[PDB]
Amino acid sequence: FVEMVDNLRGKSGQGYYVEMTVGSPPQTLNILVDTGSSNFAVGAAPHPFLHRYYQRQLSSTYRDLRKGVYVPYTQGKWEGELGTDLVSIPHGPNVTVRANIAAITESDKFFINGSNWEGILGLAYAEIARPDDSLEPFFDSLVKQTHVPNLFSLQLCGAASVGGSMIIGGIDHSLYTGSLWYTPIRREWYYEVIIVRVEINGQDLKMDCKEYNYDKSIVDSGTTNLRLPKKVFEAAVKSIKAASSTEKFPDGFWLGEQLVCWQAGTTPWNIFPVISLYLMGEVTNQSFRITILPQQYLRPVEDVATSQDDCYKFAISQSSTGTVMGAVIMEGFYVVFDRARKRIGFAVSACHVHDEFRTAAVEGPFVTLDMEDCGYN
Ligand SMILES: CC[C@@H](CC(=O)NCC1CCCCC1)n1c(N)nc2cc(Cl)ccc21
């Protein structure tokens, strides 16, 4: 696993990418690690944002599937040609698999201007694969062709430049401290989990637990913020406002539209509360909690090429599509995607940033009744 440690790189807010090789002879590409999608889709045309792109025709092991794919989302679409080719990960397991590859020939608002990645590794399940669930995802192809165990674990470490580790086929003990606790994957499509309880400095948020998972709660490496449903976001902010009422901040700060600055390098971490998220456990009526520090949700401002000091951005935002546990959560925790056993493990990361008096935690067990009722149908 030592060869797989520190195999992730990226820029702040632009995601985490891993080095991958496709085709014969091998073409080296930087590929976004994405637990929020299920397609292995790489740029295959010279879009001006891209450093590199996949050249289908120069690979002797490339096979044209003779079928297109069209993936629209919100502000954009990505599209291209479906095919298969030989894929390997230089700083991964020593194997080569024939996997599905979507050669992106056109996209709108997909690639990020200034980033160093040229494609995405959809690490989620077949059901959200496009055009349909018969297009086998990369990790499915990996496990079915090799003896690599059906799991991977992510340690995202966040610093402009960021690093991390994607351990494929196991768990590295030295990437976490304390104990690993597991939450069941509710449904195999996104990495869907169930939040049963939320606390702010120990104070229960007092919401119907169905609100925390409306209409969904996912673990996504392709998202930066901790995104919460409107009604949950409202209460959490109102609670964070209350905990830190010794200082008032502009209304735009809570919306992520304005920055807040203190004389470097202190900085009142103490007035900001810890946020505990209770997740459904492996056992009936059993749950566990993950505690995030003010240091996870107050991020040093991305691009301050004019504005020095300390300065911060509020990294909790509202969502209309359910809870998203992004880098805000994931950078605080070593996250194990145990696909073979339908579960996701959380343990305090060895690379999380802690303050002088408080510590991030994964603790349990807790008694929580009707946890299944917190999931939305
Ligand atoms: C479901 C969550 C969203 C979050 C998002 O919008 N992320 C930024 C997105 C990541 C994938 C490359 C393009 C930018 N999301 C993720 N994780 N992967 C996605 C891929 C597509 Cl085609 C659309 C939305 C995606």
The domain containing residue 254 runs over which residues?
Answer: 149-377
Phi first, then psi, for residue 236 (nearest 5°) are -60, -45
Looking at the structure, do residues 97 and 219 belong to the same domain, yes or no?
A: no
Pair (85, 187) in one structural domain: no
Nearest to 366 by CA among 191, 196, 186: 196
275-280/8-11 β-pairing = unpaired
Contact 118, 43 (CB under 8 A): yes
Identify whether 250 is part of a domain: yes
SS3 38: coil
Cis peptide before 265 (omega within 30 of 0): yes
361-367: strand order across its sheet: 203-204, 195-200, 275-280, 286-292, 361-367
Q: How is residue 56 written in tokens?
A: 């289908």
Q: Which two tokens stand for residue 228?
A: 């919460």
- For the chain, the maximum distance between any two Cα atoms, rounded to a whole number of angstroms, is 66
Q: Are residues 286 and 338 in the same domain?
A: yes
Query: What is the DSSP code (8-state) at residue 174?
Result: G
Q: Which of 6, 34, 133, 355 is catalytic?
A: 34
Residue identified by tokens 């040609």 is 81
Question: What does the angle CA 199 – CA 275 – CA 9 come to, to the nearest 5 degrees?
Answer: 150
Alpha helices in the chain (DSSP H): 138-145, 230-243, 294-297, 327-330
* Residue type at 183 in one-letter notation: T
Tokens 């020939």, residue?
105
CA dihedral angle for residue 71, residue 74, residue 75, residue 77, rounded to 10 degrees = 0
Could you give the C-alpha distances from 333 to 8, 27, 221, 352, 373, in angstroms and in order?
15, 32, 12, 7, 26
Rg (CA), the chain: 21
Same domain, 131 and 262: no
- The span from the CA of 97 to the CA of 206, in Å, is 49
Cα separation of 53 and 307, whole Å?
35
> Which residue in the block uniquely carries the two structure tokens 């606790």?
181
Distance between CA atoms of residues 98 and 57, nearest Å: 16
Taking phi over 0 as left and psi of -120 to 50 as alpha, with beta for the rest, 229 belongs to beta
> Are 225 and 286 members of one domain?
yes
Measured distance CA(60)–CA(374) in Å, rounded: 51
Q: Which amino acid is at 19?
A: E
State the burial class of residue 34 (Cβ atoms within 10 Å of its Cβ: 0-12, 13-18, 19+).
buried
d(CA 165, CA 169) in angstroms, rounded, equals: 13
Active site residue 220: yes
What type of residue sits at position 112?
A: I
Q: Are residues 169 and 85 in the same domain?
A: no
Ligand 1 contacts CB of residue 223 (under 6 A): yes
User: Taking Cα atoms as reference points, which of 155, 163, 200 lies closest to residue 180?
Assistant: 155
Closest ligand 1 atom to residue 73 Cα is 23
Asked if 260 contacts 238 with a C-beta cutoff of 8 angstroms, the reply is no
370 contact partners, CB below 8 Å, separation of at least 6 = none
What b/e string do you get for 187-222 counting C-beta neighbours within 10 Å, with b at 16 or more? eebbbbbbbbbbbbeeeebebebebbbbebbbbbbb
What residues contact residue 273 under an 8 Å CB cut-off, 6+ apart?
A: 200, 201, 239, 240, 243, 244, 294
- Cα 121 to Cα 221: distance, rounded to the nearest angstrom: 11
Distance between CA atoms of residues 375 and 280, nearest Å: 10
Angle (nearest 5°) at CA 275 between 274 and 278: 140
Q: What SS3 class is residue 297?
A: helix
Q: Which residues are paired to 81 by β-bridges?
A: 68, 103
Kind of pairing, strands 181-184 and 343-348?
antiparallel
Report yes or no on 256 lying in a domain: yes
Residue with CA at minimum distance from ligand 1 atom 3:
36
Sign of CA dihedral 294, 297, 298, 302: positive
Place of tokens 């996209």: 107
Provide the number of structural domains found in the chain.
2
CA–CA dist 320, 328 (Å, integer): 18
Shared domain check, 286 and 352: yes
Q: Is the CB of 120 under 6 A from ligand 1?
A: yes
How far apart are the CA of 39 and the centre of ligand 1, in A?
A: 11
- Residue 3 within a domain: no
Whether residue 26 is preceded by a cis peptide bond, meaning omega within 30 degrees of 0, is: no
Residue nearest to ligand 1 atom 12, measured at CA: 110
Q: Please answer whether residues 83 and 62 qualify as being in contact, where contact means their C-beta atoms are separated by less than 8 angstroms.
A: yes
Name the DSSP class of 252: T
Q: Is 259 helix (H, G, I), strand (E, B) or coil?
A: coil
Please write down the long-range contacts of 308-313, taking CB distance under 8 Å and 24 or more positions apart.
309/261, 309/262, 309/263, 309/264, 310/261, 310/262, 310/263, 310/264, 310/265, 310/267, 311/259, 311/260, 311/261, 312/259, 312/260, 312/261, 313/256, 313/259
One domain for residues 259 and 355:
yes
- Which of 126, 148, 170 represents a domain boundary (last residue)? 148
Chain-centroid distance of CA 62 in Å reads 30
How far from each other are the two terminal CA atoms of the chain, in whole angstroms? 40
- Give yes or no for a contact between 124 and 37, defined as CB atoms under 8 angstroms apart: yes
- Concerning whether 215 is annotated as a catalytic residue, the answer is no
Q: Phi-psi region for residue 85, left (φ > 0), alpha (ψ -120 to 50) or beta?
A: beta
What's the gap in Å between 37 CA and the centre of ligand 1? 7
Residues 86, 187, single domain; the answer is no
Substitution candidate for ligand 1 out of 16, 71, 73 with most atoms within 8 A of CB: 73
User: What does the block give as tokens for 130?
Assistant: 């496009």
The two structure tokens encoding residue 343: 């579960």
Q: Indicate whether 236 and 307 sit together in one domain.
A: yes
Residue at 334: amino acid letter:
Y
Q: Is residue 314 domain-shared with residue 207, that is, in the same domain? A: yes
- Set 6, 220, 251, 355: catalytic member: 220
Spatial distance between the Cα atoms of 312 and 267, rounded to a whole number of angstroms: 10
* Closest to 212 measured CA to CA, from 227, 190, 223: 227
**Same-domain pairing of 117 and 209:** no
Last residue of a domain, one of 148, 177, 200: 148
Looking at residue 105, its amino acid is: T
Query: Residue 373, Cβ neighbours under 10 Å: how many?
Result: 13
Q: Output the CA–CA distances (angstroms, integers) from residue 227 to 9, 50, 177, 257, 320, in the order listed.
A: 23, 29, 26, 15, 9
Determination technique for this PDB entry? Answer: X-ray
Q: Where are the beta strands (DSSP E) in 272-315?
A: 275-280, 286-292, 298-300, 312-314
- Domain presence at residue 4: no
Residue 256 burial by CB count (10 A; 0-12/13-18/19+): exposed, middle or buried? middle
Indicate which CATH number applies to the domain containing 186: 2.40.70.10
Listed residues 121, 148, 175: the one ending a domain: 148
> Pseudo-torsion of CA 169, 170, 174, 175, nearest 10°?
70
